[PDB]
Design a protein around this ligand. Structure first.
Ligand code: SAH
Lengths: 285, 202
């Protein structure tokens, strides 16, 4: 079955024919895989800070006011291509030069990860330059692949250089500092998730990214200090600090936020013996 | 025009004998700084490949993985291209499902193979937007790229001559000349190409 030919013929995207992509019923047929995710999510929930958020004009803001240092940063600057490709923005759009000027290195923890939504065009290249500037190494590329099961078939094509129809977005993952999978299992649980998210294309004017990106980040890094830059009211989430220009209210207090991670608490979630016995690990050397 | 091929070492073949191609596709054995059960080309060997002589106007398809997702971008630039798309091949199992288990990447598991799409010069006679940038096909091996790509490339640039680097026997196709070190001998049909070959290798 040639699903490329089938798209040409019918407008149904090839990704429409991938089976069993839903998040909730994912491992319904594999109780031990489901148990690993269930137990890790319970561990995240038990240790989550209550939601915190700050309205801020990020281009004018002194980013060093966000403390303490962050174990993970999720960055979703509003690219003009989100609205133009699908429609008129109700906030300032950011160029890649604007994004690059952010001083992310001033708030990242010495060992930490970043997840940068880059779109599907020049951002795949310019986001890599931003990673370099901030002191990260590109280490994974999480692709959000969009199905069109509800409204086949062929849609927008606005980028004079593009030659294929663009049906995905890339979230680049970067690593800062030294992390060794064999010795740093108190900081990361590798290989729990895959670098793909598959959902139906959102409604017109809906620029949200799939909530599964939070699950991938939270499963992967045991650091509890999580920053979502350019988040909105609708993305506020326990375990996260959300900072963005369109937030309509602010509850962030830097001292109170930091107190959740300091003694007698830890900035790490810890782990249970049950999760240690279920999670993927290397064999003996 | 029928399938044609040259068993050769691509580092040393005088590639100027082949003429100009509207599409170049390459699936090189990148040095990914890992132990592998097959031989690789060094970064310098990749940089030095004489891709620039193969085309003046048209498209490049460069499969990349690992650290080559940056090295491949560098090579696209050393060879004179600008990146204008990125295809991903989503690998499925026998039941059209994602293989989610194992430890198949360093930090996250890996469900896809990436192919950079570059453009050079001022190509003409191409059709934009006919295909999606996502391929869905069952894996045999990740080296074994999906045959779907040939139809996408033919719909993009129909009727033009095309060249594939690091191809294996199964990759030979009408309208294509295939280069690789595991091909069966030498089989040219284009009169101009074999004329230049006989002049260069008599
Ligand atoms: N220096 C070199 N010159 C020519 N071929 C080489 C080479 N080094 C490695 N190769 C060959 O390049 C091929 C790459 S793996 C082949 C993948 C191919 N795209 C497919 O779809 O199946 C292998 O046959 C390997 O033997």
């Amino acid at each position: 079955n040639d699903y490329c030919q089938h798209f040409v013929d019918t407008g149904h995207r090839p990704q429409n024919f991938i089976r069993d992509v839903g998040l909730a019923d994912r491992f319904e047929e594999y109780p031990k895989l489901r148990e690993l995710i269930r137990l890790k999510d319970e561990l995240i929930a038990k240790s989550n800070t209550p939601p915190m958020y700050l309205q801020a004009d990020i281009e004018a803001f002194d980013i060093r006011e966000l403390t303490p240092k962050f174990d993970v940063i999720l960055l979703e600057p509003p690219l003009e291509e989100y609205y133009r490709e699908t429609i008129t923005a109700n906030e300032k759009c950011w160029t890649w030069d604007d994004i690059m000027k952010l001083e992310i290195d001033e708030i990242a923890a010495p060992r930490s990860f970043i997840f940068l939504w880059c779109g599907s065009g020049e951002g795949l290249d310019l986001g890599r330059v931003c990673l370099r500037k901030w002191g990260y190494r590109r280490c994974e590329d999480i692709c959000w692949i969009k199905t069109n099961k509800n409204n086949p078939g062929k849609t927008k094509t606005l980028d004079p250089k593009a030659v294929f129809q663009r049906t995905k977005e890339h979230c680049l993952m970067g690593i800062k500092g030294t992390v060794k999978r064999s010795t740093d299992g108190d900081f990361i649980h590798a290989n729990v998730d895959i670098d793909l998210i598959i959902t139906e294309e959102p409604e017109i004017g809906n620029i949200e990214k799939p909530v599964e990106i939070f699950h991938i980040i939270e499963h992967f890094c045991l650091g509890r200090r999580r920053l979502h830059l350019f988040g909105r009211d609708s993305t506020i989430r326990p375990g996260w600090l959300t900072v963005g220009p369109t937030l309509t209210n602010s509850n962030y207090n830097a001292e109170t936020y930091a107190s959740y991670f300091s003694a007698p608490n830890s900035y790490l979630t810890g782990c249970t013996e049950e999760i240690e016995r279920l999670r993927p690990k290397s064999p003996p050397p | 025009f029928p399938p044609q091929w040259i068993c050769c070492d691509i580092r040393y073949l005088d590639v100027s004998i082949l003429g100009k191609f509207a599409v170049v596709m390459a699936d090189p054995p990148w040095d990914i700084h890992m132990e592998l059960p097959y031989g690789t080309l060094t970064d310098d060997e990749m940089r030095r490949l004489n891709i620039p002589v193969l085309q003046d106007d048209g498209f490049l398809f460069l499969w990349v993985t690992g650290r080559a997702m940056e090295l491949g971008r560098e090579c696209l630039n050393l060879w004179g291209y600008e990146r204008v798309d990125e295809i991903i091949w989503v690998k499925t199992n026998q039941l059209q499902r994602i293989i989610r288990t194992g430890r198949t990447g360093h930090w996250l598991n890996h469900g896809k193979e990436h192919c950079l799409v570059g453009v050079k010069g001022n190509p003409q006679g191409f059709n934009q937007g006919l295909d999606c940038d996502v391929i869905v096909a069952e894996v045999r091996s990740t080296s074994h790229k999906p045959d779907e790509i040939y139809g996408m490339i033919e719909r993009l640039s129909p009727g033009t001559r095309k060249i594939e680097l690091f191809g294996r026997p199964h990759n030979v196709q009408p309208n294509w000349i295939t280069l690789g070190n595991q091909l069966d001998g030498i089989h040219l049909l284009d009169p101009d190409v074999v004329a230049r070959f006989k002049q260069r290798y008599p």
